[PDB]
Every structure is written in structure tokens, then in C-alpha cells.
Symmetry: C3
Subunit: 214 residues, 3 copies
């Protein structure tokens, strides 16, 4: 009866990026950011970093419900991301911009996060292409971890050691919910980092993670 994705909104003539209401599988309305420009348009954005205004070093409950601002930076929420990716096949695009306004990206053929009981386990399909290189396949089939809920494969606490929240193993090659450290940083791997892109010592200006039906 109503649009189920950003792709449906684009097909109905909504050509400007912006926040729109879609209807989840259980018919629950959810207001989401549609990217109607990048790579054909019709992407639903679930993470956005742009200026460091929002604290991403948050706990399990906050990541679960979503946080931030429609005017800037946000994480849409693990329950919503699960609901968006649970049924069907959604492709993942990651877009990264450095402080000299160079763009890189990574695209994966499928992406989903499982539900809370499986700790928002990441299920990721094949790397398809991207100038940022592949720094997410390494995290496939890992639980999500936050500072207060360590589900990683390190004897210590990765979320604390890298000041983020992610599908940490031992520990990471990407850390996009890390600190907004602004370009090159001496501190090791605690910024908005993508190892195969700018490496463990460069924190991007912009990060966006988004999905679209395959």
C-alpha cells in the first residue's frame, strides 16, 4: 500500500535526497534518509558521519535503538537495520570522503544484520567493486560489540581500545563508528578508518553506509 524502500520512492518520482517515511515488513513506519543521487539512487542510509558533532562511542542500548540527528550524523539503529535487511537481498554501499574531497567507495552484493538474539551478526556477501578496497569481508559472521557488551575475539575489549562500535574480531580492519579524528592521526586505528582505503591512521571526513534491494 505504501513505499517499502527508498528505491520505491525513487521509482515514484522522489528525486531529491532527504528523509522520507517508508514501511517496514511488519508495516511499521520508519523515517529514513534516502540517497537519490549516488550510483543510480534509491539507497537507504543507515550510518552517516560528516562533521564530528555526534558522539559515536555509545553503549549497546543506544546502538540498538539508533541515535544522532536527521540534520547531520546518525546511526539508524540495529533493530531497524535488521528489519530493513532481514527479508530480501539488500546490496551495501559504503561511501567515504577524505579531507581533500576525494571520494572512495566499496560495494557488496548482499548485506544483512541478524536480530538482537544473534547479536546483530553481520552476514555479508561478496565484494563487487570499489576504490576503497574491501575492509569488511574480514568482519563477516561476527557479532556486533559495544563498550558495555564485548562479543569480540580479543582477550581485551576492542570497542574500548578503538573507541567505537562494530563487528569486531581481533580487532578490526574497518572502524567507521570510531572517533571523528580529522585526517591523519598518530593514534592507532581509533578513527573513522578503512584499512584498505586510507589506512589505520587516517580518519575520513564523510562516511555513509547505505542499502538498496538487489
Amino acid at each position: 500500500t505504501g513505499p517499502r524502500t527508498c528505491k520505491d520512492l525513487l521509482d515514484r518520482g522522489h528525486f531529491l535526497s532527504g528523509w522520507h517515511t517508508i514501511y517496514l515488513p511488519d508495516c511499521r513506519p520508519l523515517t529514513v534518509l534516502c540517497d537519490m543521487d549516488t550510483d543510480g539512487g534509491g539507497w537507504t542510509v543507515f550510518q552517516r558521519r560528516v562533521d564530528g558533532s555526534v558522539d559515536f562511542y555509545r553503549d549497546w542500548a543506544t546502538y540498538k535503538q539508533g541515535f544522532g540527528s536527521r540534520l547531520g550524523e546518525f546511526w539508524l539503529g540495529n533493530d531497524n537495520i535488521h528489519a530493513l535487511t532481514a527479508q530480501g537481498t539488500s546490496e551495501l554501499r559504503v561511501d567515504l570522503v577524505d579531507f581533500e574531497d576525494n571520494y572512495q567507495f566499496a560495494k557488496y552484493r548482499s548485506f544483512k544484520v541478524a536480530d538482537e538474539a544473534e547479536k546483530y551478526n553481520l552476514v555479508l556477501g561478496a565484494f563487487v567493486e570499489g576504490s576503497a578496497g574491501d575492509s569488511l569481508t574480514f568482519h563477516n559472521n561476527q557479532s556486533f560489540s559495544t563498550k558495555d557488551q564485548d562479543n569480540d575475539l580479543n582477550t581485551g575489549n576492542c570497542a574500548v581500545m578503538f573507541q567505537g562500535a562494530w563487528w569486531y574480531k581481533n580487532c578490526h580492519v574497518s572502524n567507521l563508528n570510531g572517533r571523528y579524528l580529522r585526517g591523519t592521526h598518530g593514534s592507532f586505528a581509533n578513527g573513522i578508518n578503512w584499512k584498505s582505503g586510507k589506512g589505520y591512521n587516517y580518519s575520513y571526513k564523510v562516511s555513509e553506509m547505505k542499502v538498496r534491494p538487489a
Copy 2:
């Protein structure tokens, strides 16, 4: 008070609206108003009525313009004295003032209650106790004062405070805060005509960000 829809940004937060942004609320029996909800700061659930962030909007405005509200949802605004009255008539809304300097240091001030009276009574400020805040208390001084704009001098100065300090506020013998002042960008030689909070950065420092917001105490 509306039983059929959300009455405040706090109700919206309690119903699972977790992102900050512009939402519709229902004022006391029963007018809809679209407001900016801050769902992050200090528990979330604040309704924002004033916002300065980049100097794009002129705040040196007249009585009619302050009455109806002005600026933009995309940046800087004043929600409007009639809306602010309607929002705080009653009945124990707390006030939080958030200030950010040009080196990205955050300060704030919180008050236990806040309301502005109606246009008759000149949007008189009724302010409760200072509770806490790193910015210090630079608003208690303005308690029980009429609002003044350049074309409507209701202050206790022989001259016109709004003109002398290039703003609009609950001016008395003029002021110790001036958050609707000029966007002067950090330290300024001109006296007390910027976005100033005396007990915070003083009469010669204009903040980068200012937000005034309310929440049921």
C-alpha cells in the same frame, strides 16, 4: 493538554523517535506545531526554540518578527514568542541553554522552570532556580522582565538596550546575557553586542553555537 497525540519532544522520545529533528507536537488543547527535538543532549526530549550556528540569519529584528518566529529549519531560528508562550504556559518546563565556543568547548546552563507570558504582559520571563551548569547563571538577573526589541523598548534603561546591544531579549539595565545578539565570531572589541553570556565567556566573546530548549521538568 492533548491526550490524542504527542505533547512534547519528551513524549516523542518515549514513543521511539530516537533521532533529533523536526517533528509535529500538539500544544495545550489542541494546536499542532512543528518543532526541533533534541533527542541526544542530557537524556533527550528537549524542544529547541532558539538556535544559532553560523550567522546566516539576522537576529536584529522587530517586535512582529520575534512574535511570529523567524529563520529556517535548516539552520538558525527563533520559534516565535507566541509559540514559546503556548509551549511553556503552565506548568514546569525546564530550560537548558547550550553554548559552544570556537574551540569547540561546550558549556551549559539549566533552570528548573521557564515560561514566557503572553503578548499582553510583553512576553514577561518567569524563570525558576538555577540548577547547574558550566556556563554559570547569566539569566536569573533577567527574571520578571519584559521582552524588548529595537522598535519596542520595554527595558529599564533610559535608552534602548536592544539597539545598544544589537539584539532582542528580556533586557533590564540592559544585560548579562544576549543570545539573540550579533554573530560576531569569537573575541570582539565591541562591548556586549555579540552572542554573550557574562558568566560563561563574558561581554567580549560571541559563541559559535547557542541553543535554548525546554523539557517537562
Copy 3:
């Protein structure tokens, strides 16, 4: 219901008590809903904004199909789309205001008494009324009665391609004195006339920080 009870312009919305600038739904003449940016704050308010530059986040060097449907973001920069702009201006008389801000915080503007863009078959031909006033000076009258041109569809009066030479999309002639869909070059630039330029304002080597083009029924 919605079409007939609903606002047709930003001016209607202002008349109904919406005093903050922001994105609202209006209903076009053919009853199609369109979400537009209303400016309620500048010069009496009630303006429908159809172009906005503010930070360089959106690429404006785009093709004919993209300009036709509109592009960018409600959070920042956009072009509303040539079909929408035609639909907004087709019936009656809309005045045009152009607002420009430089990197030193100087505000300039230009106002024109009418502004209309024809439909796709007429290549979104500009029909512009008299210059009324403005501190930016008049750098649009020169473009009157020109087709719109994009890099892949040259309809200008130059032997070459103005949209490519000037890295934009506009009602180019041979070629321009304004280029507000040009590159976001940030203040002074050595490259010639390929920025967000208004000749009579800051000239052919200065790209403004902010650009807004907007219309209101007059």
C-alpha cells in the same frame, strides 16, 4: 481531497502561519504533490526556492535528464528540476529573486519582475521580466529568451559548448554573465568563469559561498 484544500505555493503556506523556512509539500497545477523549500524569512517571505548552493557537497555538472528531473539533497544543495520549475512558473506571474553570499559575509541580491521557463519541447526557454533592483547588479537579462543547455545538450548561441567550457548548466548564450550552476570553487579562482559567478556582482573569477534562486507569485 488534498490537492484542492492544500497549499499551491510557499506564499499560501506563509498565509496559513508557516513562518519558518523549510521543506513543505505543495500541490502543483496538475495536482501533483511536490516537496519544496520555502523561504519565509527573506524579503516578505513566501518564496519557493528552486536552486541552492551552500557548501559544494553536490555535483552540478550534470546532464540534460538529471537537470530535467532535479537532483541533490534537501539537507543542502539542489536543483529542483526543469519540469518542476516549468510547472511552478507556467501559470501566472512569478517574480524571481536571486540571493548570493560571499566568503566575507557580504550579501547581495537581484530581483526580476517576472520569470518563466517553458516546457521541455521548448528546451526550458527562459522568459525573464525587467530587472527591478539589486546590489548584485543585473547579470540575467543578458540570458533572456535562451534555451537551457547542459554538457550533453548544447542549445546555446556559441560555436562551441558553453556548458563544457564553463562547467555548468544554464540558459547560455555566447556564453554568459551568470553561471550559478557552475563549480563550487570557493572564492577567488584562476580558472575563467567556471565557478558560481555573477559578473556584475563579484565577477568571472569569484565563486560565491551561497546561491539561492527563488520565485513567488506576483
